Paper text:
In our C1-dimer model, K493 is involved in the interaction with [name], whereas K492 is rotated away from the center of the dimerization interface. The effects of single-point mutations of K493 and K492 are consistent with the more detailed aspects of our model: ALK2KD-[name] can no longer dimerize with [name], whereas K492A mutation does not have much effect. The inhibitory effect on signaling was also selective to the mutation of K493, while the mutation of K492 did not have a significant effect upon BMP4 treatment. The strong effect on signaling of the [name] mutation located in helix I of [name] prompted us to examine if this mutation promotes any specific structural changes to the [name] kinase domain structure. We also obtained crystal structures of the ALK2KD-KK in the presence of [name] and the [name] kinase inhibitor, LDN-193189. Hence, the disruptive effect of these mutations on BMP4-induced [name]/[name] signaling underscores a functional role of the C-lobe-mediated [name]/[name] heterodimer in the formation of an active receptor complex. Although the C2 dimer is less compatible with the HDX-MS data overall than the C1 dimer, it does engage the key residues that form the electrostatic interactions that we have validated experimentally as being important for SMAD signaling, including the hot-spot residues: K493 on [name] and D485 on [name].
Here, using hydrogen deuterium exchange mass spectrometry (HDX-MS), small angle X-ray scattering (SAXS) and molecular dynamics (MD) simulations, combined with analysis of SMAD signaling, we show that the kinase domain of the type I receptor [name] and type II receptor [name] form a heterodimeric complex via their C-terminal lobes. We further show that the type I/type II kinase domain heterodimer serves as the scaffold for assembly of the active tetrameric receptor complexes to enable phosphorylation of the GS domain and activation of SMADs.
Residue numbers in the entry: 206 to 325, 328 to 496
The structure:
C-alpha cells in the first residue's frame, strides 16, 4: 500500500521491478503495465487463493492498484532478494559443488511442490515460463521460483483444468518442442508439467557450466547461445528444437567430476523430444537427495 520506491533494479517485457520500503524494510515491487494486466491478475490470483508458501517459491506480501504519473499502476509486492536472479547471479560468480547442488536442489523442490496437489492444501500448478531470469537467489543460498503469471492449475477432486485467459506465451528460447510445433495437448494438465521439466533441463545446463571442477568452468551462456540469436523468434526456435532436434552440448570436462556427470544424466532425461519420457519434478528432486 503506502510504500516508498527507492531504486528500480531491472526491467523485463511486462514491467519494472523496484526495490522499495514498507515499514522501513526491503520489498520487491513489480509494477505492471496495464498492457499486461492479465499477468498481474493471474499472479494475484494464485497468491491470494492458494496457500503458496514454501522455502523455494517467491514469498508474496500484497497486491494492489495505485495511481502514479496520472495513470493506474498494478503492484505485486514480494520478498526482496538482494542477490537478484539466478541469471544475473550465474554471470558474476562460479560455483563449487556444495553451492551448485544447493541451487539445483532448491529449484527441484520448488517445482515439485508446485507440480503436486496437496489435500487439506493446494491444487497442482504448472509454471509455463520457467527460466534462469524467473528464479531468485536468496541470502541463505536457496533459490526460489517467481513469476506465476502464466500458471495453470488442476484439482484432482474436480478434475477441472484452469488455464486462464492470458494471451502471453512463454519465453521463446525455453519452449519445449510440443509448444513450438503447436501439437501440445491443451486439455491435459500433465502436458504443462512436461513443458516445465524441459525448461528445467535447460536451466540445469546453465547452472552446471558454472561449477568449478578441476579449476575450469565454462562462461555463462544461455541455452542455444550458439545456434539462435538473442531475442530469437518463434521460427528460429522451431528449426533448432523441432526439426534438427538439437540439445545443448555437454562439455566433457564434466566427465572429470562425479556430480557434473549426474547432472548431465539428469538434463538429457529432461529434454527427450517425447514429453512422456521426461522425468517428473518428483524424481529429479529425489535423485538430488
Ligand atoms: N523479488 C525480486 N527481488 C529482487 N530482484 C528481483 C525480484 N524480481 C525481479 N527482480 C530482478 O528484476 C529483474 C527484472 O525482472 P522481470 O521484470 O521479472 O523481467 P525478467 O523476469 O527478468 N524477464 P521477462 O519478464 O520475461 O522480460 C529480474 O531479472 C531480476 O534481476
Ligand atoms: Mg519475471
Ligand atoms: Mg523475475
Ligand atoms: Mg512471482
Ligand atoms: Mg507476471
Amino acid at each position: 500500500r503506502q510504500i516508498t520506491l527507492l531504486e528500480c533494479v531491472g526491467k523485463g517485457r511486462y514491467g519494472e521491478v523496484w526495490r522499495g520500503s514498507w515499514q522501513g524494510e526491503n520489498v520487491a515491487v513489480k509494477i505492471f503495465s496495464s498492457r499486461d494486466e492479465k499477468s498481474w491478475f493471474r499472479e494475484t490470483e494464485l497468491y491470494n487463493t492458494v496457500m503458496l508458501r514454501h522455502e523455494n517459491i517467491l514469498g508474496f506480501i500484497a497486491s494492489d492498484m495505485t495511481s502514479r504519473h496520472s495513470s493506474t499502476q498494478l503492484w505485486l509486492i514480494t520478498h526482496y532478494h538482494e542477490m537478484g536472479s539466478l541469471y544475473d547471479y550465474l554471470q558474476l560468480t562460479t560455483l563449487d559443488t556444495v553451492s551448485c547442488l544447493r541451487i539445483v536442489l532448491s529449484i527441484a523442490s520448488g517445482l515439485a511442490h508446485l507440480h503436486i496437489e496437496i489435500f487439506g492444501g493446494k491444487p497442482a500448478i504448472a509454471h509455463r515460463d520457467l527460466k534462469s531470469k524467473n528464479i531468485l537467489v536468496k541470502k541463505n543460498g536457496q533459490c526460489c521460483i517467481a513469476d506465476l503469471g502464466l500458471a495453470v492449475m488442476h484439482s484432482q477432486s474436480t478434475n477441472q483444468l484452469d488455464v486462464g485467459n492470458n494471451p502471453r506465451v512463454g519465453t521463446k528460447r525455453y519452449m519445449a518442442p510440443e509448444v513450438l510445433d503447436e501439437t501440445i495437448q491443451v486439455d491435459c494438465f500433465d502436458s504443462y508439467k512436461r513443458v516445465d521439466i524441459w525448461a528445467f533441463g535447460l536451466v540445469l545446463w546453465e547452472v552446471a557450466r558454472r561449477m568449478v571442477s578441476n579449476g575450469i568452468v565454462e562462461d555463462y551462456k544461455p541455452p542455444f547461445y550458439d545456434v539462435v540469436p538473442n531475442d530469437p523468434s518463434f521460427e528460429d526456435m522451431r528449426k533448432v528444437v523441432c526439426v534438427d532436434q538439437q540439445r545443448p552440448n555437454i562439455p566433457n570436462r564434466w566427465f572429470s567430476d562425479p556430480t557434473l556427470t549426474s547432472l548431465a544424466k539428469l538434463m538429457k532425461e529432461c529434454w527427450y523430444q517425447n514429453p512422456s519420457a521426461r522425468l517428473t519434478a518428483l524424481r529429479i528432486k529425489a535423485t538430488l537427495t
